[PDB]
Design a protein around this ligand. Structure first.
Ligand SMILES: *[C@@H]1O[C@H](CO)[C@@H](O[C@@H]2O[C@H](CO)[C@@H](O)[C@H](O)[C@H]2NC(C)=O)[C@H](O)[C@H]1NC(C)=O
Ligand SMILES: CC(C)CCC[C@@H](C)[C@H]1CC[C@H]2[C@@H]3CC=C4C[C@@H](O)CC[C@]4(C)[C@H]3CC[C@]12C
Ligand SMILES: *[C@@H]1O[C@H](CO)[C@@H](O)[C@H](O)[C@H]1NC(C)=O
Ligand SMILES: [K+]
Ligand SMILES: [K+]
Ligand SMILES: [K+]
Ligand SMILES: [Mg+2]
Lengths: 39, 268, 992
């Protein structure tokens, strides 16, 4: 917007962290699954 | 030789020459495409400069400016940087209707020169006289520090509204058009004196938004001179200058995020 | 020091009984005096063995703390505390950087110390096992009276008494004996009881009957003797000292590790000081000059590599534990793969160590029995009525019996009370005719004449199980020729017939052939006594010939031997196909040694000794060109008078070598001889007479079930199930781990470049620091760990058992070809991908690449809280630093992303991924966990403080992707060239 362009200097680092941690966890689980296919 | 024969030494050179040549050519290619995705007027991200920093002219050894009044070369170090900044706000530097403009001698509202486009020439910036900085060689005794708000493209600094209580409760509250700066230390052993545009202790909103170096060269940002004519002597005084606003915030880590950290000591 | 012990012993068995007493001031009848014995005790010292001085574990741990990488990491750790000290004095720095980084680095050294300490293990209790062979007490005659004393109180000169069941307390001169038999397997590896008597019977004291040795036991009878040697001075006490004293030495794998440590340490100190001076010339304060150096150290040293190696070794040892192959020393996991020569004991190693029936001669025909443990062969005969007649004599004319409670275990494995030949016959009949006890119940024995030294035969009279007869049957067995002189008829295919010269000659032929096979041959015959001449109550006199022992019916011959283990012949061939030379080294007699050599394939068909040529051509052995003989059989008595140079010529000039009747020191000498030629040697054995050889071997392998305690103490590896096929598996595993270590090392080293280059450009370019010191440790200690380990699970790219053993002088674990690829090619591509993401982060925040050159001065200036970017904006100190640390984070993540491709390319040295596939589940696990770790390190809240890791925007992750892909393609194209032309260019330059 014009004088109300506050969103330009903002970033949702909170969501990014939530998503990043979700991904890291799921990649960790996936890895266990493939490894445990025989121990 | 060490490893191989001459014939082998050559072939290993012809390889790494072509190899590293290709790699350099590829690296450069990826740099090209990166640049191709970027604007010339505005950076892709601005969230890391977001809350504006407040910086001053006196080059602090460690957020500190200690010196002796009864000594000449005791403060000549801080006068070097003080001069460096103010030397830019000369009237001879601001000549003609291009690219400067005479703006309200009193704090006014924002000025939009269109978009971040080259569809116009150099966006015309507001003039600023160093003569608006009353009282301030500089203060040989009791320094005359000069404040500054860090430039951010498209940033509209918004002052606080007088809805509720305020630190400098309602005094000279130019609510609509001034970004205030109140310095503090309890420990009240000083004498705060502020100088600026229109005589106000803030930044005139008519100097915003900044259109960037590419669209606004020679642009001048507003200054706020602060003088500490403290009646005390020979002690470290931790003075913090704070700016207030809707778009202004602070951090425990970044001690320059919209504030000062000055340790004055007139050890004379 | 031990050169004296490598020699054959000298003795006094040639002296008379009386003469021997003069030498030791002793009485043959009264024994020593209580006072004289105590005097000699203080004189000579105790009858005991003293363990050699060991190196304390303290010094062993700390010796690892100073090996190249640890030295450099120490210099870094101290240089951290140096810069910290210089700070704490000058400008009060409230930070924790140098202090904490110095603590972290010192911990890395200590923990890395534990890993190398675990790898360099030496579990040795040789002397302890020997000490277990000295009895607690001994029986001596002192002042004309026998008393039990502490065996340590035994001295040279006293009169000792032994009987069946007790250990020989010391080396004795036999002066009196009654039916005494002894088990000399300690000195020979052969357990067949050896008679002991006062009479001297051989010039060689290790063969004479009038000497009994410490480390052996009396098996039966009784004997008295004069002590000639005590403690360390006994024959086997010296073997003990020799074995326990032998210097261990460095393994092939250990030597390889130290070698690349020198290389990497070399480049580290090179670039280290090369840029330390390069910085001072550029006018960098010593305050900074050291900070850069610390970074250089951390970049160059692969912090997690030595521990990777250890884990890869451990995991390989775990797989072998699961095939009944125990590894005592982690490094021995690889030595077997580098082995070019195997020196193998015969008895209990190549062989089962059990007299077993091998052939039978009946019906004018040679039949072969199955000698294998699990009986993997086939039948020979069941139909012939002759067989049942021979079978009956083998069961009936036999006094051997199975021990109680064995019905659970297989026939051939069960313990038997009796001599070896009777046990063999027992197990033979029990196997192919069912319960022998049944046959001995159906035919009650009424009278017998047990095998006599003079008779050379054993006879028995039984009540025929037949109801229509119920009469008296006579059976006998003995020396084949003696049995022949007592026969008139031969049971041919059922019916008897006169013994004509024809069948008599066929007998001699059969007899000579079986004997030629190194087999012990016995004759079997029976006689159905006439009914009218022998009533149902007729008494038979065993003392005086009360019955005919002539004109009997010859039934057949039976031959026997201690046979090879089932898997042995095939394992030997497999070792030989892998280009490993196999030598036999045995305490057993030459005829037996040679026969098993041919049986297992040590001596291949057609190959001759000089003696074979001479007999075939009917010419003198001196007339034979010895170069015409590729095979040789060396008796220990001849070995004794040969110099090592002459032993070296034997080793060089023969492909098929048999060392027979060797002493324990002689086995050591043969091993050393092989090593002297530059060969990596394995020893396989099971006896205490293998202990020195097992110790000296680059790798000693002991048998687990049949092995003596001593042998298993001296070994690096134990075959817990006695499965000789495990050697073949071991060499295969050893070769595979060697290749996979290269892959894992290249992988780990490759990421050193993207950690080095940022520090260099930081100096030469004056730009903001692209990657931090902490960030490097997050790679080498964090993300790269599981991927690097996972390479240990790689399958072979080709048939590794088809190639020759590596040349330990030329074929190195880390060579110039590895460095060229890891440092010069792939690592260089990774460095760029790192820098790219760095320039991306900065440029998207407002600092375009052009304006970055020579800005570090203002960038690092803590007092400039207004640096101008390319767009004209002003940044505080902490603001720009957040972007900088975000650059460290994405550079870090760029390494991870480019290591994805590197992990896949390091999978194979030659083959394509499209050929080898992606069947390594640990590797895939590594990829997922590596990425999970990196994401966690970036996105987890608080990590921005502890590690300076900042959240990355989604687009940031993809910066290095085009570089990750170029790596995959590049290496795939390169290896395509290797395969397409075995010539050499790409091969001799980059083929790891
Ligand atoms: C900007 O203004 C300052 C004001 O102090 C100028 O400083 C002058 O320097 C000259 C020569 O050194 C002196 O003779 C004067 O006394 C100074 N003051 C004035 C008001 O003229 C400085 O030169 C100016 N800089 C530029 C680039 O124009
Ligand atoms: C950051 C940049 C400027 C550094 C570049 C370093 C280059 C020149 C280095 C890195 C790895 C190096 C190579 C590594 C391996 C070999 C194989 C060896 O048998 C001869 C030297 C040779 C061929 C080296 C020559 C120089 C080399 C190519
Ligand atoms: C500042 O200077 C003015 C003259 O320009 C003078 O009148 C005044 O006293 C000064 N103020 C202080 C606080 O010293
Ligand atoms: K490293
Ligand atoms: K050994
Ligand atoms: K590394
Ligand atoms: Mg043996």
């Amino acid at each position: 917007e014009g004088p109300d362009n506050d969103e330009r200097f903002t970033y949702d680092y909170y969501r990014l962290r939530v998503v990043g941690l979700i991904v890291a966890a799921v990649l960790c689980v996936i890895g266990i699954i493939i490894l445990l296919a025989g121990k | 030789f060490l490893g191989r024969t001459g014939s082998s030494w050559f072939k290993i050179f012809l390889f790494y020459l072509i190899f590293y040549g290709c790699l350099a050519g590829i690296f450069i290619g990826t740099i090209q495409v990166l640049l191709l995705t970027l604007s010339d007027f505005e950076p892709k991200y601005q969230d890391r400069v977001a809350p504006p920093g407040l910086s001053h002219a006196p080059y602090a050894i460690k957020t500190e400016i200690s010196f002796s009044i009864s000594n000449p070369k005791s403060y000549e170090s801080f006068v070097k940087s003080m001069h460096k900044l103010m030397d830019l706000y000369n009237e001879s530097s601001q000549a003609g209707n291009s690219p400067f403009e005479d703006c309200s001698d009193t704090p006014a509202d924002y000025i939009k020169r269109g978009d971040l486009d080259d569809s116009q020439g150099q966006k015309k910036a507001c003039r600023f006289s160093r003569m608006w900085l009353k009282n301030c060689g500089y203060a040989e005794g009791k320094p005359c520090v000069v404040a500054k708000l860090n430039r951010i493209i498209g940033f509209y600094p918004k002052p606080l509204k007088n809805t509720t209580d305020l630190p400098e409760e309602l005094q000279a509250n130019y609510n609509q058009y001034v970004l205030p700066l109140r310095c503090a230390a309890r420990e009240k052993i000083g004498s705060i004196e502020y100088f600026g545009l229109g005589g106000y202790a803030g930044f005139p909103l008519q100097y915003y938004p900044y259109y960037g170096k590419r669209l606004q060269k020679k642009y001048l940002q507003p200054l706020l001179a602060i003088q500490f004519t403290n009646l005390t002597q020979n002690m470290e005084l931790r003075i913090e200058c704070k700016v207030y606003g809707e778009n202004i915030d602070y951090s425990e880590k970044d001690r320059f995020r919209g504030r000062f950290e000055v340790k004055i000591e007139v050890k004379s | 020091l031990d050169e004296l012990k490598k020699e054959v012993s000298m003795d006094d068995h040639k002296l008379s009984l009386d003469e021997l007493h003069n030498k030791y001031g002793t009485d043959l009848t009264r024994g020593l005096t209580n006072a004289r014995a105590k005097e000699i005790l203080a004189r000579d010292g105790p009858n005991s063995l003293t363990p050699p001085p060991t190196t304390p574990e303290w010094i062993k741990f700390c010796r690892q703390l100073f090996g190249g990488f640890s030295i450099l990491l120490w210099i870094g750790a101290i240089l951290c505390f140096l810069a910290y000290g210089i700070q704490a004095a000058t400008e009060d720095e409230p930070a924790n950087d140098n202090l904490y980084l110095g603590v972290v680095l010192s911990t890395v050294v200590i923990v890395t110390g534990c890993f190398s300490y675990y790898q360099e293990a030496k579990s040795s209790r040789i002397m302890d096992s020997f000490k277990n062979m000295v009895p607690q007490q001994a029986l001596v005659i002192r002042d004309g009276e026998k008393s039990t004393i502490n065996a340590e109180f035994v001295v040279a000169g006293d009169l000792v008494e032994v009987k069946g069941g007790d250990r020989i307390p010391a080396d004795l001169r036999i002066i009196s004996a009654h039916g005494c038999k002894v088990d000399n397997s300690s000195l020979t590896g052969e357990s067949e009881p050896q008679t002991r008597s006062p009479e001297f019977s051989s010039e060689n004291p290790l063969e004479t009957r009038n000497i009994a040795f410490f480390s052996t036991n009396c098996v039966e009878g009784t004997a008295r003797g004069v002590v000639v040697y005590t403690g360390d001075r006994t024959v086997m006490g010296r073997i003990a000292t020799l074995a326990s004293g032998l210097e261990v030495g460095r393994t092939p794998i250990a030597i390889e590790i130290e070698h690349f440590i020198h290389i990497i340490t070399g480049v580290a100190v090179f670039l280290g000081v090369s840029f330390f001076i390069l910085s001072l010339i550029l006018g960098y304060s010593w305050l900074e000059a050291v900070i850069f150096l610390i970074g250089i150290i951390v970049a160059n040293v692969p912090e997690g590599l030595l521990a990777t190696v250890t884990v890869c070794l451990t995991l390989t040892a775990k797989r072998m534990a699961r095939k009944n192959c125990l590894v005592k020393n982690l490094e021995a996991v690889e030595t077997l793969g580098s082995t070019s020569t195997i020196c193998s004991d015969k008895t209990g190693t190549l062989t089962q160590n059990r007299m077993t029936v091998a052939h039978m001669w009946f019906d004018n025909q040679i039949h072969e029995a199955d000698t294998t443990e699990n009986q993997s062969g086939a039948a020979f005969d069941k139909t012939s009525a002759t067989w049942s007649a021979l079978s009956r004599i083998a069961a009936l004319c036999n006094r051997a019996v199975f021990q109680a409670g064995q019905d659970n275990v297989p026939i051939l494995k069960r313990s038997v009370a009796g001599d070896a030949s009777e046990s063999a016959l027992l197990k033979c009949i029990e196997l192919c005719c069912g319960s022998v006890q049944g046959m001995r119940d159906r035919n009650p024995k009424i009278v017998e004449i047990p095998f006599n030294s003079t008779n050379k035969y054993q006879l028995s009279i039984h009540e025929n199980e037949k109801s229509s007869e119920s009469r008296y049957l006579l059976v006998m067995k003995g020396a084949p020729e003696r049995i022949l002189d007592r026969c008139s008829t031969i049971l041919l295919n059922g019916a008897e017939e006169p013994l004509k010269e024809d069948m008599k000659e066929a007998f001699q032929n059969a007899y000579l052939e079986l004997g030629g096979l190194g087999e012990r041959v016995l004759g079997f015959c029976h006689f159905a006594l006439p009914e009218d001449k022998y009533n149902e109550g007729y008494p038979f006199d065993a003392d005086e010939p009360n019955f005919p022992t002539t004109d009997l019916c010859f039934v057949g011959l039976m031959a026997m031997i201690d046979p090879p283990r089932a898997a042995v012949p095939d394992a030997v061939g497999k070792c030989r196909s892998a280009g490993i030379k196999v030598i036999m080294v045995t305490g057993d007699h030459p005829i037996t040694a040679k026969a098993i050599a041919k049986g297992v394939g040590i001596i291949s068909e057609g190959n001759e000794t000089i003696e074979d040529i001479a007999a075939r051509l009917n010419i003198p052995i001196g007339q034979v060109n010895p170069r015409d003989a590729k095979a040789c059989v060396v008796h220990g008595s001849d070995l004794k008078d040969l110099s090592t140079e002459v032993l070296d010529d034997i080793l060089h000039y023969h492909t098929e070598i048999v060392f027979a009747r060797t002493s324990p020191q002689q086995k050591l000498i043969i091993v050393e001889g092989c090593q002297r030629q530059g060969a990596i040697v394995a020893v396989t054995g099971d006896g205490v007479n293998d202990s020195p050889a097992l110790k000296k071997a680059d790798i000693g392998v002991a048998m687990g079930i049949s092995g003596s305690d001593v042998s298993k103490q001296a070994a690096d590896m134990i075959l817990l199930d006695d499965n000789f096929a495990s050697i073949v598996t071991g060499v295969e595993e050893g070769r595979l781990i060697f290749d996979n270590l290269k892959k894992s090392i290249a992988y780990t080293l490759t990421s050193n470049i993207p950690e080095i280059t940022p520090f260099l450009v930081f100096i030469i370019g004056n730009v903001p620091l692209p990657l931090g010191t902490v960030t490097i440790l997050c790679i080498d200690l964090g993300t790269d760990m599981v991927p690097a380990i996972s390479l240990a699970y790689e399958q072979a790219e080709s048939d590794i058992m088809k190639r020759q053993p590596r040349n330990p002088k030329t074929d190195k674990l880390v060579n110039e070809r590895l460095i060229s690829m890891a440092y010069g090619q792939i690592g260089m591509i990774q460095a760029l991908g790192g820098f790219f993401s760095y320039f991306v982060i900065l440029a998207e925040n407002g600092f375009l690449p052009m304006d970055l050159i020579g800005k570090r001065v203002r960038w690092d200036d803590r007092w400039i809280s207004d640096v101008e970017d390319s767009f004209g904006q002003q940044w505080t100190y902490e603001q720009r630093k957040i972007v900088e640390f975000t650059c460290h984070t994405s550079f870090f993540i760029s390494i991870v992303v480019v290591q994805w491709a590197d992990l896949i390319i390091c999978k194979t040295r030659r083959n394509s991924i499209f050929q080898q596939g992606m069947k390594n589940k640990i590797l895939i696990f590594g990829l997922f966990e590596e990425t999970a770790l990196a994401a966690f390190l970036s996105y987890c809240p608080g990590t921005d403080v502890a590690l300076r890791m900042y959240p990355l925007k989604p687009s940031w992750w993809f910066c290095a992707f085009p570089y990750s892909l170029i790596i995959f393609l590049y290496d795939e194209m390169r290896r395509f060239i290797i395969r397409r032309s075995p010539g050499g260019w790409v091969e001799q330059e980059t083929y790891y």
